[PDB]
Each structure stands twice: as structure tokens, then as C-alpha cells.
UniProtKB/Swiss-Prot annotation, chain A:
A single Gene Ontology CC term: cytosolic ribosome
Covalent link Glycyl lysine isopeptide (Lys-Gly) (interchain with G-Cter in SUMO2), residues: K97
Keyword Translocase included in the entry's annotation: no
Species in which this protein is naturally found: Oryctolagus cuniculus
Superkingdom of origin: Eukaryota
Positions spanned in the full protein: 12 to 130 of 145
This protein's UniProt keywords: Acetylation, Cytoplasm, Isopeptide bond, Ribonucleoprotein, Ribosomal protein, Ubl conjugation
Main function: Component of the small ribosomal subunit. The ribosome is a large ribonucleoprotein complex responsible for the synthesis of proteins in the cell.
The name this protein goes by in its record: Small ribosomal subunit protein uS19
Localization: Cytoplasm
Coiled-coil regions, chain positions: none
Keyword Ribonucleoprotein: yes
GO MF term list: MDM2/MDM4 family protein binding; RNA binding; structural constituent of ribosome; ubiquitin ligase inhibitor activity
Primary site of residence: cytoplasm
From Swiss-Prot, chain B:
Family, per entry: Belongs to the universal ribosomal protein uS3 family.
Cross-link Glycyl lysine isopeptide (Lys-Gly) (interchain with G-Cter in ubiquitin) mapped to chain: K71
Domain of life: Eukaryota
Residue positions where N6-acetyllysine is found in the record: K43
Presence of the UniProt keyword rRNA-binding in the record: no
Positions spanned in the full protein: 20 to 131 of 243
Modified residues (Phosphoserine): S16, S85
UniProt keyword terms in alphabetical order: Acetylation, Apoptosis, Cell cycle, Cell division, Cytoplasm, Cytoskeleton, DNA damage, DNA repair, DNA-binding, Isopeptide bond, Lyase, Membrane, Methylation, Mitochondrion, Mitochondrion inner membrane, Mitosis, Nucleus, Phosphoprotein, Ribonucleoprotein, Ribosomal protein, RNA-binding, Transcription, Transcription regulation, Translation regulation, Ubl conjugation
GN (gene name): RPS3
Domain KH type-2: start-end pairs: 2-73
Native source organism of the sequence: Oryctolagus cuniculus (Rabbit)
Modified residues (Asymmetric dimethylarginine): R45, R46, R48
Protein name as catalogued: Small ribosomal subunit protein uS3
UniProtKB/Swiss-Prot annotation, chain C:
Underlying gene: RPS27A
Sequence position, cross-link Glycyl lysine isopeptide (Lys-Gly) (interchain with G-Cter in ubiquitin): K25, K31
N6-acetyllysine: modified positions: K22, K31
Location of the region described as Disordered in the Swiss-Prot/TrEMBL record: 1-13
Protein known as: Small ribosomal subunit protein eS31
Annotated compartments: Cytoplasm; Nucleus, Nucleolus
Binding partners and assembly: Part of the 40S ribosomal subunit. Part of the small subunit (SSU) processome, composed of more than 70 proteins and the RNA chaperone small nucleolar RNA (snoRNA) U3.
Originating species: Oryctolagus cuniculus (Rabbit)
Span of zinc fingers (C4-type): 39-62
PTM notes: Monoubiquitinated at Lys-25 and Lys-31 by RNF25 in response to ribosome collisions (ribosome stalling): ubiquitination promotes subsequent activation of RNF14, leading to EEF1A1 ubiquitination and degradation and rescue of stalled ribosomes. Deubiquitination at Lys-31 by USP16 is required for maturation of the 40S ribosomal complex.
Function: Component of the 40S subunit of the ribosome. Part of the small subunit (SSU) processome, first precursor of the small eukaryotic ribosomal subunit. During the assembly of the SSU processome in the nucleolus, many ribosome biogenesis factors, an RNA chaperone and ribosomal proteins associate with the nascent pre-rRNA and work in concert to generate RNA folding, modifications, rearrangements and cleavage as well as targeted degradation of pre-ribosomal RNA by the RNA exosome.
Residues of the full protein shown: 83 to 150 of 156
UniProtKB/Swiss-Prot annotation, chain F:
Taxonomic lineage: Eukaryota, Metazoa, Chordata, Craniata, Vertebrata
Spans through the membrane: none
Whole sequence portion shown: 18 to 117 of 119
Main function: Component of the small ribosomal subunit. The ribosome is a large ribonucleoprotein complex responsible for the synthesis of proteins in the cell.
GO-annotated molecular function: RNA binding; structural constituent of ribosome
Post-translational changes noted in the entry: Polyubiquitinated by ZNF598 via 'Lys-63'-linked ubiquitin chains when a ribosome has stalled, initiating the ribosome quality control (RQC) pathway to degrade the potentially detrimental aberrant nascent polypeptide. Deubiquitinated by OTUD3 and USP21, antagonizing ZNF598 activity. Ufmylated by UFL1.
Protein name per Swiss-Prot or TrEMBL: Small ribosomal subunit protein uS10
GN (gene name): RPS20
Coiled-coil positions: none
One cellular component term from this protein's GO annotations in UniProt: cytosolic ribosome
Organism whose genome encodes this protein: Oryctolagus cuniculus
Keyword field contains Heme: no
Amino acid sequence: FRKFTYRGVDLDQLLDMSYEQLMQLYSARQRRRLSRGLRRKQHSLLKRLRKAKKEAPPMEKPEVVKTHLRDMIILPEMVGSMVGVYNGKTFNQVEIKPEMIGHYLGEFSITYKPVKHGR
Amino acid sequence: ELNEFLTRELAEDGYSGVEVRVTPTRTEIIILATRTQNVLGEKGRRIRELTAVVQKRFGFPEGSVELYAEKVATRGLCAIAQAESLRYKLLGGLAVRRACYGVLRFIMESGA
Amino acid sequence: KSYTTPKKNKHKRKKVKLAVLKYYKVDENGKISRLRRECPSDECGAGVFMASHFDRHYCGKCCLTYCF
Amino acid sequence: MLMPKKNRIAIYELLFKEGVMVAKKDVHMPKHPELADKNVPNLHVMKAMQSLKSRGYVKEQFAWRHFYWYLTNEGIQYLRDYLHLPPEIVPATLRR
Amino acid sequence: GHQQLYWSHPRKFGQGSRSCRVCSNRHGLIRKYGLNMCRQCFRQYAKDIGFIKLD
Amino acid sequence: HRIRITLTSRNVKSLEKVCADLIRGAKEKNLKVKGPVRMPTKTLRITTRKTPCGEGSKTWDRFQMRIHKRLIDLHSPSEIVKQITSISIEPGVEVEVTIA
RNA sequence: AGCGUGUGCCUACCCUACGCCGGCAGGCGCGGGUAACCCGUUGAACCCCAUUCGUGAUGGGGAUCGGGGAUUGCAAUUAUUC
RNA sequence: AGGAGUGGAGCCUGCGGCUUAAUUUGACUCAACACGGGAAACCUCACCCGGCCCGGACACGGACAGGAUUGACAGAUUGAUA
């Protein structure tokens, strides 16, 4: 009888945390992923995936809305989003959780088809 | 770069390169050629047209650049001044067996 | 050679004839009964009209999104 | 292609007053290096001066990556007419 | 839409971001002394630059 | 009144000439002229593969572009030297005359 | 020690002393230098000097991997590099 | 003659094979194989799975200046502020 175990910050504490206390929570590989702040170029698509992060459908296994951004982070805000992470052939669909978090989407996607040797 | 670009145009008038000298707020850029009756066209016309050819591209002021031309002293010796001779005799369309032995004889004429 | 992907057209656009009859209303008097909104934009005077879309009215080149 | 019809004669003055002009070959240079008076990108300056090329009123010359214009004397009839300039006056390439 | 999605690479680093001054090829640029020249063209035209194999 | 006439040449026959001919002639005008100061060579070494492609053997070029610098010390106002300089100018040397 | 490089048409991205914060990579100020001038008197490494370990895969060996910590980048997960 | 080595071990990277949406390709005895100044996260980049501008110069003309075509945002789609 134990839940998901993060650092010392629960999922309600994760969902509602300011974006400068959030900077001192995950690894330096993920700190400087989200230290620089806002974006003005096509990287306003992460904003548009935050905008599409509020596409939480009614009580159901949630739908797959696609992301062609493998640099998109497993944010704890996202938890409850079936995801379309493209890998050159097939859009993967792995259900997300507090365990996944502080990691990139492209990790849980196989860009290269699994290798098997013949003769 | 300036040696490359002018060679694409001034091939017919016997291009040989430059005898260029730098002076304060003047430029003696000699286009030393072989036949300079069509480096001008109509009384220094194409020479006046060759001015802001060079001036504009490289970001130069006006008044400094001024472009002159002569005949090369014994013009049969400079190789690219006689590569023009085999360029517009083969582009003219004479067989290689004649248009060469004339210009090979032309340097035994010029005492090579 | 013959490809598998279905070949992709470019649409013959909605080109409009006899435009001035609908822009304003016709009138017996010297005035004209204005239907649409004028141009309060910064870049042009009074020549551009504002459209009749569903949600708001839209000027040509100012790119300003009004509401109800 | 779309141009400003205004910004065709921002190309034609510098062609006319001196009968030679320069432009670097590139697509992605919105501010033309010599002609910053009007906003004409390098790709639009290229396409404006290759419209006069094929009908043979200007002779196009090319160095490494650079456009050059030996404005032929057949281009003088059309560009005192269409540029609306007297037949007496000459460019700065016919000056003594 | 097309025009903003026409020059959308950050063109301030990489061999693709820079370009040759002679050939517009994206390999073998002499970035020593800012020659910025495709090595094949440098070889041919270094004679009239001043680079000469004295040793 | 230290004029510092920078003499940078690609060639030796002109670096010898321009430095000497602005002293050899400047002996007759009797002004306190000094000898040319030396600076060491800068051998601009660009070592390129001879082959355009990557095939054959690896025969490397060694393109050596040596550049030298001289300057001459003086006790002179500007105009006195200017009378001598612009007479008989040759293409080799870049004469950058310093006033101070 | 000795070759050497260093502020760029396009061109933005330089070399780094010295001073502050911090164990670290690194973060921040005032200056120099288009350079026999500034980094730099290039206090280079090896061996040299003296400690220590003891014939054992050990303190040889530094592969593979986990968690952090910054920089570079518009962004690095299929660890950039430290 | 001899020295240092290599082949032996682990890793770096070039090549073949197998795999793959694509695992781009040139080169195969000395005179292919840390070779293309190729140490490719992006560009480069060739290859692939997605989407655009025609950036089809110009000549002629059935059709055009009572309008040819053009670039221009909600929103359904969308990777998109295509």
C-alpha cells in the first residue's frame, strides 16, 4: 500500500508548481531543457502542445493527439495524455504516469525498428 | 576573384591579367590586353562601362578607380594572351590540326 | 513513371463578377446606404471596407481579429 | 510570382543612371546590399532582372556567386519609353 | 505559412549554415584567415592569392 | 615628430627598395633619418590535399605565404617626407605613414 | 620548450589576462590585443625530487552503467562534450 | 642486423555482411578500407516517411482590366502562429 514516489513533491504539488521552483526539481539535463524560458520561433509549438495539453477528453481512455516533437518533455502536467510520438514509420502510444516524468517523449519511442539477425 | 570574372568577358580582346598599382584615393588598375579597339567599342564606351563593374561589387568610393588598357609588349609571349588565340579559332570552328600549327609557328615567329 | 500516391490538384479560385452592386446599396438620391464597416486602420485612409464573416468583420491588410 | 508594381522602378533607376549594377546570388537576403532605399529581397531582384534577360535587352554576366548587367543598346529603346525619360539625356556611362 | 517556413533553420552555426564564396558547396571551407573557400578552388586559384609552395 | 612609416611587403626586392630609397634619397635632404626596424615572418600555412576527391594517395600541399613588416624612425613633420614618397611608387609594399 | 592561431563583405561565432561568487565543469565584471606590443617570459608533458603501494589482476586496468551538477545549442533521448 | 610494433584484450572510427520506412553514397591488390580535407543530435544530406511556393524565363493565343490572379486569422484537420 504505497503510491507513485517522486523526490518529495506529489502529483497535485507537481501539477500546481511555479516554473522557477520546477527548475530545481528535475535533473540538469532537464533543468537547462526548461531554464531558458519562452520561445518566439516555431518552438511556440511546445506552447501549442501545452495549449493541446488542455484537450483532456471526457471520462474515457483519452484520445491520441499527435506530437512531431521528440524533444517534448514528460511533464507531470501531461500525466493523463495518450500521445502520438512519430518515429519515421509508426506513432507510438504508451500510457503515461508519475513514474515516466522528467524524461523526453522520444525516449519511449523507437526511431529504429528492433534489430534481428538472419544468416 | 577579379582575375576570374573579367576573363569570362574580355577573352575576345586578349585578356592577360593586370599591372595594378595602389595610390591614395586613386587606382591604376591596368587591364593590359592585346587588341583594345573593342575593349572600348565606341570611343572609350565599354571602358566607361567596365568602371562600376568593379567599383560597386567590392564597396569602393567614386573617383579612385580608373581603368586603362594597352597592347602587351610583344603580345605573342603571354600564354593566356595566346590561349584566347586558340579559344576563338576553335570556337570559330577550324580543325585543331591547322589552328594550332599557325599559333605554334606564331611563337617561332615571336622567337620563343 | 506511374506513382502510388494520388496526384494533388490546385483549386480554380472563387473569382467574383459585378462587385460594386453589392459593396454598397443603390439609391435614388446622391448618397449611398452603407452596409459594411469602414477602415479605422493606421496604414490606409478610407478606401478599404471590412468583411462579412460569421464571428466578426475583417479588414484586408491590418490583420486585426475583432469579436461580438 | 507576386512583386510590388511600385518596387519594379526601385530596380530600374540604378540600372539606368549608370549602365552597370551588381547583386550577390542568394535567395535569403531581404535587405539588398546597394538598394536599401526600398525593401526588395535578393530573390525578387534576381527574378526582376531575369525577366528582361530571355527577350535579350540585357546581357547577364556571372562571376563566383554575383549578378552583373552589361545593359545592351537594344534595352535603351524600351527603357527611355517605359521609364518615360527624354531621348536627348544619356546615362552616366555616355558622359565624357 | 510558406514564407516564414522558407528560412526557418537557425543559420548561425554548422557547415550547412555557412556557404562557399566560389561554388556555394557546404564542405571543405578554409576557415583559417577567413579564406572561406572550397579546398578544390583554393588549390587552383591560390597562385594569384599569394599562397605558393616555396618548400 | 616621430614619423613611423610602416613597410609591409610580400616581396624582398621592393621591401629592400622602399626602405632604402626613403633613406638613400633622404640622406641628401640631411634630415635625422634612422634605419628600417625589422619584424619577424608570419608563414600563413594552409596545408590542403592535392586531390579534389578522396581517392589516390594522400599527397598534401604546403602553401607557404610569408609576410614581413618594417618601420623607419624619424624626426620630421609630415610634408617633408610626403615630397619624397609619392614619386616612383611600385606595387609591392603597403606604405602606411604614421604622423604620431 | 618550439611551431603557432585569435575581433571575420556575407558574418553574428575571437584570444584571454586580472578581480569577485563556487569542491568541480562552470556563472558574473572592469581592460588589453586587428597582435615581436595582449593572453605569454607560452612556469607544456615526460623524466628529474621525495613520500607512499608490494608479486596478488592490487592502489595494475578504466570498459560498461546509475544518480546528480553546467556549458554549447533553436533544440542532445539513440548519455554532444566536461 | 636489430629496435619499436601490428595481429592477441577493450574501446574509437572507415568497410563488408545482416537488419531497415531510410540504415544515402563513391572507392576494393601496393595505386580502396581515421580516404572525399565526411570528428553526419539540426543545417550539411545525398536517403526516407509528411506538407508547401511555382522560385514554369519567355513567345503565341480561344479566355482578361464590368476584374486576371494574388498574399492575407478564428475553426474541423494540423506538427504548425502551413
